[PDB]
Amino acid sequence: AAVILESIFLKRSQQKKKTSPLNFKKRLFLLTVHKLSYYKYDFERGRRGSKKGSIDVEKITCVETVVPEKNPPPERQIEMEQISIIERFPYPFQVVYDEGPLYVFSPTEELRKRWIHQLKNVIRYNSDLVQKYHPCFWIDGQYLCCSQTAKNAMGCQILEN
Amino acid sequence: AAVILESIFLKRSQQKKKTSPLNFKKRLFLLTVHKLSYYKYDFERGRRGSKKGSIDVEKITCVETVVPEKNPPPERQIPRRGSEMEQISIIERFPYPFQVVYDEGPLYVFSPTEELRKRWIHQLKNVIRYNSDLVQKYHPCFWIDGQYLCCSQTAKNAMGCQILEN
Amino acid sequence: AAVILESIFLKRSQQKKKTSPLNFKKRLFLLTVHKLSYYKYDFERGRRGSKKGSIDVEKITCVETVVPEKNPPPERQIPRRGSEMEQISIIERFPYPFQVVYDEGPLYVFSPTEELRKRWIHQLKNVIRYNSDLVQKYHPCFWIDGQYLCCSQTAKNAMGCQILEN
Amino acid sequence: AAVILESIFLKRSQQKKKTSPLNFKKRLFLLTVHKLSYYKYDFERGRRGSKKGSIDVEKITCVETVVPEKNPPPERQIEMEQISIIERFPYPFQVVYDEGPLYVFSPTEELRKRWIHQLKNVIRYNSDLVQKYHPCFWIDGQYLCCSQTAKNAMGCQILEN
Ligand SMILES: O=P(O)(O)O[C@H]1[C@H](O)[C@@H](OP(=O)(O)O)[C@H](OP(=O)(O)O)[C@@H](OP(=O)(O)O)[C@H]1O
Ligand SMILES: O=P(O)(O)O[C@H]1[C@H](O)[C@@H](OP(=O)(O)O)[C@H](OP(=O)(O)O)[C@@H](OP(=O)(O)O)[C@H]1O
Ligand SMILES: O=P(O)(O)O[C@H]1[C@H](O)[C@@H](OP(=O)(O)O)[C@H](OP(=O)(O)O)[C@@H](OP(=O)(O)O)[C@H]1O
Ligand SMILES: O=P(O)(O)O[C@H]1[C@H](O)[C@@H](OP(=O)(O)O)[C@H](OP(=O)(O)O)[C@@H](OP(=O)(O)O)[C@H]1O
Ligand SMILES: O=P(O)(O)O[C@H]1[C@H](O)[C@@H](OP(=O)(O)O)[C@H](OP(=O)(O)O)[C@@H](OP(=O)(O)O)[C@H]1O
Ligand SMILES: O=P(O)(O)O[C@H]1[C@H](O)[C@@H](OP(=O)(O)O)[C@H](OP(=O)(O)O)[C@@H](OP(=O)(O)O)[C@H]1O
Ligand SMILES: O=P(O)(O)O[C@H]1[C@H](O)[C@@H](OP(=O)(O)O)[C@H](OP(=O)(O)O)[C@@H](OP(=O)(O)O)[C@H]1O
Ligand SMILES: O=P(O)(O)O[C@H]1[C@H](O)[C@@H](OP(=O)(O)O)[C@H](OP(=O)(O)O)[C@@H](OP(=O)(O)O)[C@H]1O
Ligand SMILES: [Zn+2]
Ligand SMILES: [Zn+2]
Ligand SMILES: [Zn+2]
Ligand SMILES: [Zn+2]
């Protein structure tokens, strides 16, 4: 696999451990045909750091936008550009795979749109793409959209494409 | 005072101490009417880290571009030939140097784009317009390996070898 | 047209022909709005001799100083340390070079004083202000021994390596 | 002898030969303690050329200004400076020695004044300094001043110093 894309995004903790707090971390994301991985970004060194997470491309069932946070904190609100682009991430999309939704934030709409599009392309021949989905965040216990109670609850909404 | 400009640049060590190496560091630069200061940038928290150095604006005697290194490493190479990168290159690739000269020596700063460099040179020009020690002559090339490439002078604060006139 | 400026300078051969040597000649330069021309100076008769070359003012893309030779011979050395001479030095010693860049290459001209150079650069700037091919980048150092000292480019008309900005 | 001074001047033919025309030539002049010499100036080469004339310092009886030409031609009339200084010479002085008066022109008063002064100094202990002299040119036959008829005619005027 060669790198399809590469960007720096903010991403919310997946809280796969009961202990994990709910938090956001900046990460460098790489997209190949087989995986969507993310890493610590070594800023000084100007490089990729330690791998923090991964998702097998074929286990993704749904990549979509998400309903924006009610009151983004600065960090996620809407040429200080050079800096704003790696400090402000206000455009969320979601990557849904077996475990649930991975929440990613783009510092821009274009970047965001760019990412979804290659994402779609990559999973296009998957076998479990779902045609139902949640346009919002799962949080504090439930899917803000359908109000359901399980990260893995069926999409309360329709996706055709 | 208000921050007039703020950016992330790559700068070369001023090697003020004898034991210091010649290396390059990424820093957050801010400019006010008092100083041009630079800090460690705390990427993770997205904020300004500890102050690494500064120059009092009234001590600056000259601000210009510098003739490029003849064989820069990739971190300082002009974009080659073959946008997502943009977000990243703009904090990794610094091909456009400028020099802020002041009583001590030149400070060498590298910009990610030409636009940024032009911007900063202009503002720096503005804040220095009425300084008392502006020089009319400068060294267009780096000081390096013990002397200026341009004229071979050894002293970092050797009078400039080139005049700029219109 | 009227002569805007007229002086005696020392210039380097442009070596347009392969067989040409790299040497320096004293010439009478005149500037009009049409051309910058240079002639043999007939000292004896105190007059302008035969035309040796010229450049059409509308073809000029840049006029600046040049970083000095690192080891000039005496004819091009800055006055050292220890007026009667003045009459003479001013036609023998040419330490202050400038470059007139145009589509073909740079023409290198050396002035006897700094005042003269400033003068000529200014007027040349005036006559070129609205030209169509002004460049924003130049080579601050001479072209020599096959390439520019500044950036090592070989082609005499290599795009400049340095930008001038305010 | 070391060079006391060195300048480029215009000087009139001494016409020491019946054939010689009356003419002006630019020359480089050098002043030492023993001699006042003059040469062809090699402009291209930027050097002294062939020696054209000389005057033994001790044979000089009188160095003085001269009465300016009635209608100097341009060349001798009163920052084109760099050039004017080696093209216009409108300040005459005279160097009188056995043979008569050598006529020199300065492109300036200062230069002129400078030259007379070192000249005076150099001949100060000569034994035939004359205290009579002609303030004008000898020409077309006679000393315009005293109207006399011999280049070597006694000074029609007084010089004390
Ligand atoms: O660093 P602290 O403050 O502990 O918090 C971590 C980070 O947010 C992790 O992100 P990253 O892996 O990007 O560093 C997140 O992992 P994921 O979100 O990747 O799973 C962890 O939750 P768990 O998911 O429970 O591991 C959470 O515990
Ligand atoms: O000593 P102070 O002034 O606090 O700041 C240090 C230096 O900048 C270190 O430089 P170096 O170690 O290069 O001298 C840097 O190490 P890095 O080399 O990692 O950048 C440290 O950051 P971290 O090391 O990232 O904590 C940073 O805290
Ligand atoms: O990080 P290490 O390897 O220690 O090297 C350092 C950094 O390049 C410093 O930069 P910064 O201050 O930006 O970290 C530089 O200070 P300046 O370039 O600011 O002066 C120090 O030189 P001295 O100048 O000798 O301190 C130099 O020794
Ligand atoms: O334990 P590993 O897997 O190496 O990675 C750690 C965690 O990402 C830390 O997270 P946290 O400390 O948030 O839990 C981070 O500290 P920061 O909080 O400073 O980002 C460390 O930064 P460095 O140690 O400085 O690389 C980084 O090395
Ligand atoms: O006098 P010699 O030894 O023959 O050498 C000449 C002079 O330097 C010419 O200068 P100028 O014309 O002023 O005499 C120069 O022309 P330019 O410098 O004008 O071009 C000729 O080069 P070419 O350029 O190759 O002609 C060069 O061969
Ligand atoms: O005969 P020698 O003693 O060498 O010197 C001559 C005469 O001065 C000539 O005088 P004129 O010709 O006036 O009689 C001069 O010619 P110009 O008239 O050209 O000045 C010659 O110039 P060059 O030959 O070019 O040096 C110069 O060499
Ligand atoms: O070159 P042409 O046209 O023949 O005329 C010469 C020059 O004027 C000589 O000047 P210079 O010697 O400066 O070249 C002058 O000599 P002086 O004035 O030195 O004596 C000659 O007269 P005579 O003086 O007659 O030789 C006169 O014949
Ligand atoms: O061939 P044209 O175009 O007429 O002009 C020539 C060249 O400029 C000669 O250059 P070079 O001989 O160096 O090529 C110069 O010789 P100099 O070398 O003496 O300057 C000649 O003057 P005189 O030589 O002074 O006549 C002058 O007349
Ligand atoms: Zn839902
Ligand atoms: Zn220099
Ligand atoms: Zn160059
Ligand atoms: Zn008389």
* Residue D44 in contact with ligand 8 by CB distance below 6 A: yes
Q: Which residues of B touch C118 (CB under 8 A)?
A: 165
Q: Which residues of C touch B152 (CB under 8 A)?
A: 70
Question: Residue C115, class by beta-carbon neighbours within 10 Å (0-12 exposed, 13-18 middle, 19+ buried)?
Answer: exposed
How far apart, in whole angstroms, are the C-alpha atoms of residue A86 and residue A67?
21
From the CA of D26, which ligand is nearest?
Answer: 7
Q: For residue B84, give both structure tokens.
A: 């997502």
Instruction: Pick C165's closest partner by Cβ from B121, B151, B163.
Output: B121
Which has the closest alpha carbon to B8: B33, B32, B26, B35?
B26
Chains C and B touch (3+ CB pairs under 8 A): yes
Question: Which residues constitute the domain of residue D66?
Answer: 1-161
How far apart, in whole angstroms, are the C-alpha atoms of residue C117 and residue A42?
51
Q: Are B131 and B137 in contact (CB under 8 A)?
A: no
How far apart, in whole angstroms, are the C-alpha atoms of residue C121 and residue C157?
20
Q: Are D88 and D96 in contact (CB under 8 A)?
A: no
Helices (H), chain A: 81-84, 109-123
Which has the closest alpha carbon to B139: B64, B36, B83?
B64
In chain B, the N- to C-terminal Cα span, in Å, equals 34
CA distances from B143 to B118, B146, B154, C160 (A): 22, 7, 8, 20
**DSSP per residue over D68-112, as a string?**
PPSS--GGG---THHHHTTT---EEEEEEETTEEEEEEES-HHHH
Q: Are A103 and A112 in contact (CB under 8 A)?
A: no
Sequence-distant (≥ 6) Cβ neighbours of residue D12 within 8 angstroms: D22, D23, D24, D103
How far apart, in whole angstroms, are the C-alpha atoms of residue B33 and residue B40?
21
Q: Are A45 and A55 in contact (CB under 8 A)?
A: no
Question: Bridge-partner residues for B42, per DSSP?
Answer: B47
> Is D34 annotated among the ligand-binding residues?
no
Q: Are A91 and A112 in contact (CB under 8 A)?
A: yes
Sequence-distant (≥ 6) Cβ neighbours of residue B38 within 8 angstroms: B9, B11, B27, B28, B29, B30, B51, B52, B53, B54
The number of the ligand 4 atom at minimal distance from the alpha carbon of A49 is 26
Output the residue whose Cα is nearest ligand 5's atom 14. C52
Mutation target vs D (from C3, C8, C91, C123; most D CBs, 10 A cutoff): C91
How far apart, in whole angstroms, are the C-alpha atoms of residue B43 and residue A25?
11
Question: Bridge-partner residues for D87, per DSSP?
Answer: none
Q: Are C42 and C26 in contact (CB under 8 A)?
A: no
Chains D and B touch (3+ CB pairs under 8 A): no
Which has the closest alpha carbon to D7: B131, B77, B29, C89?
C89
How far apart, in whole angstroms, are the C-alpha atoms of residue C142 and residue C68?
8
Best probe residue, ligand 2, of B27, B50, B52 (max atoms within 8 Å of C-beta): B50
> Is D62 annotated among the ligand-binding residues?
no
How far apart, in whole angstroms, are the C-alpha atoms of residue C136 and residue C120?
20
Q: Are C102 and C60 in contact (CB under 8 A)?
A: yes
Mutation target vs C (from B63, B65, B66, B67; most C CBs, 10 A cutoff): B67
Q: For residue D38, give both structure tokens.
A: 């003059």
Sequence-distant (≥ 6) Cβ neighbours of residue C27 within 8 angstroms: C8, C9, C10, C11, C38, C39, C40, C41, C52
For A139, phi then psi, to 5°, come to -175, 150
Question: Strand, coil or helix: what is A82?
Answer: helix
Cβ atoms within 10 Å, residue B163: 18
Mark yes or no for CB contact C141/B164 under 8 Å.
Answer: no
CATH number of domain containing C7: 2.30.29.30
How far apart, in whole angstroms, are the C-alpha atoms of residue B89 and residue C13?
44
Q: For residue A134, give both structure tokens.
A: 């949640």
List the single residue in B with minimal CA-CA distance to A26: B44
Which has the closest alpha carbon to C61: C152, C166, C153, C156?
C156
Question: Strand, coil or helix: what is B75?
Answer: helix
Method: X-ray
| Sign of the C-alpha dihedral computed for residues B109, B95, B165 and C11 taken in this order | positive
**DSSP per residue over C86-143, as a string?**
HHHHTTT---EEEEEEETTEEEEEEESSHHHHHHHHHHHHHHHTT-S---SEE--S-E
> Is A132 annotated among the ligand-binding residues?
no
Sequence-distant (≥ 6) Cβ neighbours of residue A158 within 8 angstroms: A131, A132, A133
Cβ atoms within 10 Å, residue D59: 16
Give the number of domains in chain B: 1
Tell me, in angstroms, the distance from the centre of ligand 2 to residue B49's CA.
Answer: 10
Amino acid at site B158: A
Question: Strand, coil or helix: what is A28?
Answer: strand
Tell me, in angstroms, the distance from the centre of ligand 3 to residue B98's CA.
Answer: 18
Give the strand pairing for A5-12 and A138-139.
unpaired
How far apart, in whole angstroms, are the C-alpha atoms of residue B116 and residue A79?
9
> Is B25 annotated among the ligand-binding residues?
yes
Question: Bridge-partner residues for C96, per DSSP?
Answer: C111
Tell me, in Å, the resolution of the deposited structure. 2.1
Which has the closest alpha carbon to B65: B114, B105, B28, B12?
B114
DSSP 8-state assignment for residue A98: T
